[PDB]
Amino acid sequence: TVPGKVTLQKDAQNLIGISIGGGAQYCPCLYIVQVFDNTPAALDGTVAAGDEITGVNGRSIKGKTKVEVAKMIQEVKGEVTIHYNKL
């Protein structure tokens, strides 16, 4: 894979617009599923399906739960960074 991080700013609804998928105690590896239209993540053209996320605003997500990561991004405001891995 290729380690990469992009600084995407939050939208009006405090949602960069990006889906993920992961578990816990077996599948702690969180990854991206797809993107939504009219979203900063889509319009920007950086983070989307195929790219595995492994960081946010410098923090580490490789180990957290789906609900944990989701709330993490929703909590962050402004220039939100996402360390995705091109696969």
Binding site: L15, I16, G17, I18, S19, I20, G21, V33, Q34, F36, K66, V67, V69, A70, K71, I73, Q74
Partner: peptide
């Protein structure tokens, strides 16, 4: 299932 944020 896919949590969107």
């Amino acid at each position: 299932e896919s949590v969107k944020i």
